[PDB]
Amino acid sequence: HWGYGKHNGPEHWHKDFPIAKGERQSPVDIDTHTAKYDPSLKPLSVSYDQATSLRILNNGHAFNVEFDDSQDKAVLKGGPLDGTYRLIQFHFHWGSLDGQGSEHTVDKKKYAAELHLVHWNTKYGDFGKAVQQPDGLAVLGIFLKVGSAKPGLQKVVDVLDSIKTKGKSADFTNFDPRGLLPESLDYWTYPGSLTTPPLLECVTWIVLKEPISVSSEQVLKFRKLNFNGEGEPEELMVDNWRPAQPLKNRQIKASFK
């Protein structure tokens, strides 16, 4: 099955998922000089005050912090969006070293990691129905650079020892994702896809300009996770990022001058 290696990594995904070579694939390089300021774009509304995390899961490619999405409690609206998108999970992509790990790039710069907060459009009723629609998901992407620790990440870091291998989960209640947000909500936006199989072209991407800082110790703990299951030959969970894909017939718009 698909993964991140030589024999099953991104360059192979098109065989099982031909949409990998589609017209609106993600991630992309964000050419900052090309991206046009769009005065019609609205401020992002991130309303996470009632977010209810439930659990954290090692799914064999990343770890997902999952939320209760049975009610309107953690929602993304405004920005480029029409209507209301509810938070289902967040996860990260990261590298083996600090010089790679992000999926989006900025003028070809790779960050150490990238956080994806995944939200589905309430007008389709559930996540599985939303991913079948071109406006089904809104993903908020946030870059990570290595420097000062992010205090609000440490609770995530300190549970990873308990979900080292694929298929392990742990109770993970009361985590506040507001602690992962940078100060500015300036963003770029474009139409794209999930960055993991099935690579469905259902996402409005909202990529924040301002990275968050995490410490080297925090990222090092991400890199102790395993792609393999318990007891299997150890292969560290690193370099779980898809590279930038062709922009094709898309415009990236900036919320900021």
Which of 190, 87, 86, 204 lies closest to 138, judged by CA? 204
Min dist CB 105 to Zn ion, Å, is 14
Candidates 7, 61, 104, 119; catalytic one:
61
| Closer of 116 and 166 to Zn ion (Cβ) | 116
Strands 203-208 and 29-30: unpaired
Looking at the DSSP assignment, which residues form a beta bridge with residue 63? 58
User: Are 218 and 158 within 8 A, CB to CB?
Assistant: no
User: Are 87 and 48 within 8 A, CB to CB?
Assistant: yes
| Closer of 38 and 198 to Zn ion (Cβ) | 198
How many CA atoms lie within 13 Å of 5's alpha carbon, on the beta-carbon side?
Answer: 10
Strands 36-37 and 253-254: parallel
Rg of the chain, C-alpha, whole Å: 17
Min dist CB 118 to Zn ion, Å, is 7
- Output the CA–CA distances (angstroms, integers) from residue 140 to 21, 45, 147, 185, 256, in the order listed: 23, 11, 22, 10, 16
| Closer of 53 and 64 to Zn ion (Cβ) | 64
Q: Does the annotation flag 91 for ligand binding?
A: yes
Which residues contact Zn ion (rule: CB under 5 A)?
116
For 10, phi and psi rounded to 5 degrees? -45, -35
For 21, phi and psi rounded to 5 degrees? -105, 25
Structure tokens of 59? 């799914």
Q: Does the annotation flag 7 for ligand binding?
A: no
> Of all residues in this chain, which one has the CB nearest to Zn ion in the complex?
116
61 is catalytic: yes
| Closer of 41 and 142 to Zn ion (Cβ) | 142
Amino acid letter, 55: R
| Closer of 84 and 89 to Zn ion (Cβ) | 89
Residues of each annotated binding site for Zn(2+): 91, 93, 116
Residues of each annotated binding site: 91, 93, 116, 195-196
Q: Which residues are catalytic?
A: 61
